[PDB]
Design an enzyme around this catalytic site. Structure first.
Site, PDB file in Angstrom:
ATOM      1  N   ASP A 116     -51.936  64.311  20.314  1.00  0.00           N
ATOM      2  CA  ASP A 116     -52.642  65.515  20.790  1.00  0.00           C
ATOM      3  C   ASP A 116     -53.427  65.156  22.051  1.00  0.00           C
ATOM      4  O   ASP A 116     -52.835  64.577  22.978  1.00  0.00           O
ATOM      5  CB  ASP A 116     -53.464  66.083  19.653  1.00  0.00           C
ATOM      6  CG  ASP A 116     -54.103  67.402  20.025  1.00  0.00           C
ATOM      7  OD1 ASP A 116     -53.367  68.412  20.029  1.00  0.00           O
ATOM      8  OD2 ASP A 116     -55.313  67.433  20.334  1.00  0.00           O
ATOM      9  N   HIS A 313     -47.717  70.668  14.073  1.00  0.00           N
ATOM     10  CA  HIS A 313     -48.585  69.900  14.964  1.00  0.00           C
ATOM     11  C   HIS A 313     -49.161  68.664  14.284  1.00  0.00           C
ATOM     12  O   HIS A 313     -49.332  67.615  14.924  1.00  0.00           O
ATOM     13  CB  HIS A 313     -49.735  70.768  15.456  1.00  0.00           C
ATOM     14  CG  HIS A 313     -50.724  70.011  16.278  1.00  0.00           C
ATOM     15  ND1 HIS A 313     -50.431  69.552  17.542  1.00  0.00           N
ATOM     16  CD2 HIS A 313     -51.970  69.564  15.992  1.00  0.00           C
ATOM     17  CE1 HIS A 313     -51.466  68.881  18.013  1.00  0.00           C
ATOM     18  NE2 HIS A 313     -52.414  68.873  17.092  1.00  0.00           N
TER      19      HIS A 313
HETATM   20  O1  LIG Z   1     -54.968  71.937  22.460  1.00  0.00           O
HETATM   21  C1  LIG Z   1     -54.472  70.995  21.919  1.00  0.00           C
HETATM   22  N1  LIG Z   1     -54.397  70.883  20.480  1.00  0.00           N
HETATM   23  C2  LIG Z   1     -54.844  71.902  19.559  1.00  0.00           C
HETATM   24  C3  LIG Z   1     -54.786  71.278  18.167  1.00  0.00           C
HETATM   25  C4  LIG Z   1     -54.843  72.312  17.047  1.00  0.00           C
HETATM   26  C5  LIG Z   1     -53.751  73.370  17.150  1.00  0.00           C
HETATM   27  O2  LIG Z   1     -54.107  74.400  16.259  1.00  0.00           O
HETATM   28  C6  LIG Z   1     -53.380  74.456  15.067  1.00  0.00           C
HETATM   29  C7  LIG Z   1     -52.246  73.683  14.848  1.00  0.00           C
HETATM   30  C8  LIG Z   1     -51.566  73.794  13.645  1.00  0.00           C
HETATM   31  C9  LIG Z   1     -52.029  74.668  12.673  1.00  0.00           C
HETATM   32  C10 LIG Z   1     -51.307  74.813  11.342  1.00  0.00           C
HETATM   33  O3  LIG Z   1     -50.455  73.961  10.976  1.00  0.00           O
HETATM   34  O4  LIG Z   1     -51.576  75.805  10.621  1.00  0.00           O
HETATM   35  C11 LIG Z   1     -53.154  75.442  12.891  1.00  0.00           C
HETATM   36  C12 LIG Z   1     -53.829  75.331  14.089  1.00  0.00           C
HETATM   37  C13 LIG Z   1     -53.710  73.990  18.556  1.00  0.00           C
HETATM   38  C14 LIG Z   1     -53.756  72.969  19.696  1.00  0.00           C
HETATM   39  N2  LIG Z   1     -53.928  69.839  22.609  1.00  0.00           N
HETATM   40  C15 LIG Z   1     -53.768  69.614  24.030  1.00  0.00           C
HETATM   41  C16 LIG Z   1     -53.356  68.141  24.196  1.00  0.00           C
HETATM   42  C17 LIG Z   1     -52.946  67.920  25.609  1.00  0.00           C
HETATM   43  C18 LIG Z   1     -54.188  68.240  26.504  1.00  0.00           C
HETATM   44  C19 LIG Z   1     -54.655  69.690  26.303  1.00  0.00           C
HETATM   45  C20 LIG Z   1     -53.513  70.579  26.776  1.00  0.00           C
HETATM   46  C21 LIG Z   1     -52.307  70.400  25.994  1.00  0.00           C
HETATM   47  C22 LIG Z   1     -51.800  68.901  25.958  1.00  0.00           C
HETATM   48  C23 LIG Z   1     -52.566  70.437  24.444  1.00  0.00           C
HETATM   49  C24 LIG Z   1     -54.976  69.881  24.902  1.00  0.00           C
END
Ligand SMILES: O=C(N[C@H]1CC[C@H](Oc2ccc(C(=O)O)cc2)CC1)N[C@]12C[C@H]3C[C@H](C[C@H](C3)C1)C2
Length: 336
Positions: A116, A313
């Site tokens: 991540d 994720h």
């Molecule tokens: O935002 C980032 N991660 C969050 C992590 C949590 C997820 O939410 C979720 C995921 C899964 C579930 C489920 O299974 O129910 C629920 C909520 C959403 C995104 N990562 C980045 C990492 C790099 C740098 C920047 C830009 C781009 C690339 C993505 C941040």
């Protein structure tokens, strides 16, 4: 040794802090079974912590690796500086380099793995610190090129682009930081972020709008955390000063600072080029970081290994055994 995942307060590892570049860094330290072959530093993302590597840490220890998994800046027992410049990829990469060398010596090398936001960190760390990084892997997060321009994300999504990232507007603003405070709200937040659903199956989070605050009071148990894991995330996040999510959310507040760092490197500095062995593990069902986003990334690597695991994720845990063996087999090839 037992190679099952770390439980909260697991006795197989040590919990320590070190001063690192002006900050207290807390980390998990796992010592190797048998002679130490390498030191592996593992870097989590949002909203995770060092414990997010619980499946990988004992597995790597059993293979002869010393494992250092920090709580990254802003998280759990680690300091959360007020200054956003401390949260840039370059500054956090320097933190990692100093922490790593506090274990392997200034002349030493490490294996570096990320997930991540941590995956974004470790690509930058291998770029900024090639002297240190012997092998590097990222789960879910592909390589992004050096930023040659800066455009506010508001204008990007208002033009209809990068719409899978629109949740980052909410995260970087005041709303999550203000509303998710205290253990009871943190618990509801973690139920949402690890897959919990409302009474009629409504999600607690979306990539379009971020945290759905009105779902949080009715959100059910998360399928991706058991009850004691959930409570450990709550307890560890509650170590942060109120508002507890300021540190973690600061990671979404650095787009301009990171761009300024890299527009420089993109004009004077060396090009993005990874000569050391690298591994990228995609996750089929990650909707923020879909495998397709890694399309043009192989050109930047002399020696990139690709893998894909069938998971959401939260691939380190949901596909922990498969991720472990992908990493372990790659390390066999990468280090020998
Ligand atoms: O935002 C980032 N991660 C969050 C992590 C949590 C997820 O939410 C979720 C995921 C899964 C579930 C489920 O299974 O129910 C629920 C909520 C959403 C995104 N990562 C980045 C990492 C790099 C740098 C920047 C830009 C781009 C690339 C993505 C941040």
């Amino acid at each position: 040794m037992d190679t099952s995942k770390l439980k909260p307060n697991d006795p197989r590892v040590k919990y320590e802090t070190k001063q690192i570049r002006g900050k207290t860094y807390s980390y998990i330290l796992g010592e190797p079974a048998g002679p130490k072959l390498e030191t592996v530093v593992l870097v989590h993302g949002w909203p995770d912590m060092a414990f997010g590597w619980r499946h990988q840490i004992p597995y790597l220890m059993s293979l002869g690796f010393q494992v250092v998994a920090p709580n990254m800046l802003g998280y759990a027992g680690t300091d959360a500086p007020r200054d956003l410049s401390q949260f840039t990829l370059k500054s956090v990469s320097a933190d990692i380099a100093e922490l790593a060398r506090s274990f392997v010596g200034q002349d030493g090398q490490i294996v570096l793995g990320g997930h991540d936001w941590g995956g974004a960190v470790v690509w930058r760390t291998a770029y900024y610190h090639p002297e240190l990084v012997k092998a590097v892997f990222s789960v879910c997060t592909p390589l992004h090129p050096l930023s040659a321009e800066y455009k506010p994300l508001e204008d990007i999504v208002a033009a209809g682009h990068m719409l899978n990232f629109k949740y980052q507007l909410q995260l970087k603003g005041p709303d999550v930081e203000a509303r998710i405070q205290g253990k009871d709200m943190l618990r509801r937040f973690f139920r949402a972020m690890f897959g919990g659903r409302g009474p009629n199956g409504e999600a607690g989070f979306s990539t379009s709008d971020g945290v759905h605050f009105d779902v949080l009071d009715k959100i059910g148990a998360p399928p991706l955390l058991d009850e004691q894991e959930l409570e450990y995330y709550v307890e560890q996040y509650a170590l942060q000063e109120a508002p507890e999510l300021r540190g973690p959310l600061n990671w979404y507040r650095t787009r301009e600072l990171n761009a300024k760092d890299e527009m420089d490197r993109a004009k004077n500095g060396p090009p993005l080029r990874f000569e050391m062995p690298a591994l990228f593990v995609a996750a089929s069902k990650d909707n923020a970081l879909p495998p397709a986003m890694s399309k043009g990334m192989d050109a930047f690597y002399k020696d990139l290994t690709r893998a894909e695991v069938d998971a959401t994720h939260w691939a380190l845990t949901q596909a922990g055994d498969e991720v472990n063996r992908v990493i372990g087999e790659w390390l066999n090839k990468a280090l020998g």
